[PDB]
Each structure stands twice: as structure tokens, then as C-alpha cells.
Design a binder for this molecule. Structure first.
Ligand SMILES: N[C@H](CCC[C@H](N)C(=O)O)C(=O)O
Lengths: 167, 167
């Protein structure tokens, strides 16, 4: 088990119905925030991934949670659509050429804790390590590719300092 | 770099006074339990890591927490002595030739949750990737190399199914 990713079944996900595959290795990573509630325990962040997926599935009518992975302030990564299934998180130009990771919260006036950030970068290395990502992958913030405040001012200024970030 | 580890400072560890280095690559991994209180959040697990360190330093007179790494039921790994410094967790024959990882809890009547187990296994893969552990490393229960009940019956039964387990 590559990163220490919480599997779909462990956060009680509805089964996915998405079919569209991403072509590896993938070039881009897009970092979003959920603009949802935050959580900082495994129990609270499992519920929160449930809740986000529930909105996407029941309400937006999507095949699964839109993000490939979610990050909790518990410092764990929650399997969304995964490495191999095209996401619904950054519009039609970016969904097919990226992995979308989303921090569970609103980081406009808040920073995610260092454990959340470590879990994100550990996830990405793990992606390289598996061949899901390019070794020279490029990180975009959600607002760099779509009109939105996502991932929040505070979170966005941090991912700007990441070695793989490209505006 | 590899994995995600909660660093010493983040859990508010006393400065280490330990100096003896292990010789890489290390061949053996010894898995214990602390036989202490469990914790299932980053906040409670950081506290617990302090308590364990406090006990070993202040009461037992050791140079640091005895373990190289601790595992919380929050699903995070807590930095102890690290990959490079000799632990105090398995006696004078095993301490110089092993990495000691301890699950924070009492696993006599109780299993650690899948996320603790994942954190532990991934940690070891990272030791391998790092050259800290041999690729053909062996995992031992604490009871395999010393008389005590550690790492606890339930947890012992689990580590017996790990692919690197050798009695
Ligand atoms: N490569 C990872 C280990 C994960 C196992 C992965 N190789 C798989 O079987 O999918 C690492 O060293 O962090």
C-alpha cells in the first residue's frame, strides 16, 4: 500500500461508476480546496470525504467524487477516483491531463497543518514512484486553471513555494 | 525523501542526547507495543509520544525515547531515534542491529486499526527505499527476541502474516 492512503471502503464511499481512464504518466497536478468543512481526526475526515462524495454523486449527478484524492487535516490522504480514473475537478481542458488533489477545508483565511502538507507531497512522490505521475510533474493551483478562489489564498501561497509549482 | 513522519519537534520531543549510530543497511526490524494508552488523533498521539519519551528519559534515564519510530492509531508515524541512531527497545544483542518500531497502545486484547498497520508497513518500505533497511529485512515480534508479551497477542498474530516476518 503505496502512500498511507485511506481506501475507498474505509471512508465508506459509494461505489464509483466512472469509466474514463487517465493516460499515465500524468503531467499535471491541480491543488484545490473543498471549500467545505474541515476535519482533523480520522473519524471526522472519513465523514467529510463521505459528505463531499455524497454532494457530488447525489446532487451533481457525477459518477464519483470529483477529486482523485482528498487531504485531511488529520494528515491522511483519502482515495477519491485514484491514479487511473479521470477526475472532475478542474474543467474539461485540465481533467484529462491531471491528477486533482483537494484539501478538505477552506484555506482563504486558514492554513492547512504541516501534516496535511506532508501527506500531499508524500502522495505525489508515491505517484511518481508508481508511474502515475511524471518525475518532472507540474503543480498548478486550481485558480491558475479555472476561475475560482480555490485553493484559498493561504493554501495557494504555500503551494507557490513548492519545487514543482508552475504558474 | 520518503513517506510522511511526524518530526520530533512537531510532537514536542525533548532534545535527544543519543550518539551511537546503527550500521546501514539494517537487517532486522523489531515490532513492539508500548503497552500504554492508545490515541486516535494527531493531537492525542503527539501527547502520547511525549509521555512515552518522558517516561524513558526521565524515569528510565535513557538518552531519548527508546524506539526508532512510534505508530499511532491516528495512522501517523512519530519520529523517535530515527533511521540512523541506535535504539533501546530490544536488549543489548538486538538494539545494535535493528530498528525498533512501537505501536502506541496495548494490543493484548485489541488490534491496531488498518491505518496504523499501513503507516507501519509504508515506513518500512521507506527504510528500504532510503537504504536504512536491507531489501531483504526481517521483522521480528519483540517476544521473538526478548521474554515479554510485547507487541501483544493480537498484534503479534498480525505481524506473523507480514511477508518479511521471520520468527
Ligand atoms: N513503492 C512504494 C511502496 C508501495 C508498493 C507499490 N510498489 C505497489 O505495490 O503498488 C514505496 O517505496 O514507497
Amino acid at each position: 500500500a503505496c502512500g498511507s492512503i485511506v481506501p475507498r471502503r474505509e471512508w465508506r464511499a459509494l461505489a464509483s461508476e466512472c469509466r474514463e481512464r487517465l493516460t499515465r504518466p500524468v503531467r499535471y497536478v491541480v491543488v484545490s480546496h473543498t471549500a467545505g468543512s474541515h476535519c482533523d481526526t480520522p473519524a471526522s475526515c472519513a465523514q467529510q470525504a463521505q459528505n463531499v462524495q455524497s454532494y457530488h454523486v447525489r446532487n451533481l449527478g457525477w459518477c464519483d467524487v470529483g477529486y482523485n484524492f482528498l487531504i485531511g487535516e488529520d494528515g491522511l490522504v483519502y482515495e477519491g477516483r485514484g491514479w487511473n480514473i479521470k477526475g472532475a475537478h478542474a474543467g474539461p481542458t485540465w481533467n484529462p491531463i491531471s491528477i486533482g488533489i483537494s484539501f478538505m477545508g477552506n484555506y482563504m483565511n486558514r492554513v492547512p497543518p504541516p501534516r496535511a502538507l506532508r501527506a500531499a507531497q508524500n502522495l505525489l512522490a508515491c505517484g511518481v514512484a508508481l508511474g502515475a505521475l511524471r518525475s518532472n510533474y507540474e503543480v498548478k493551483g486550481h485558480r491558475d486553471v479555472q476561475p475560482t478562489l480555490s485553493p484559498g489564498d493561504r493554501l495557494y501561497e504555500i503551494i507557490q513555494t513548492w519545487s514543482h509549482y508552475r504558474a
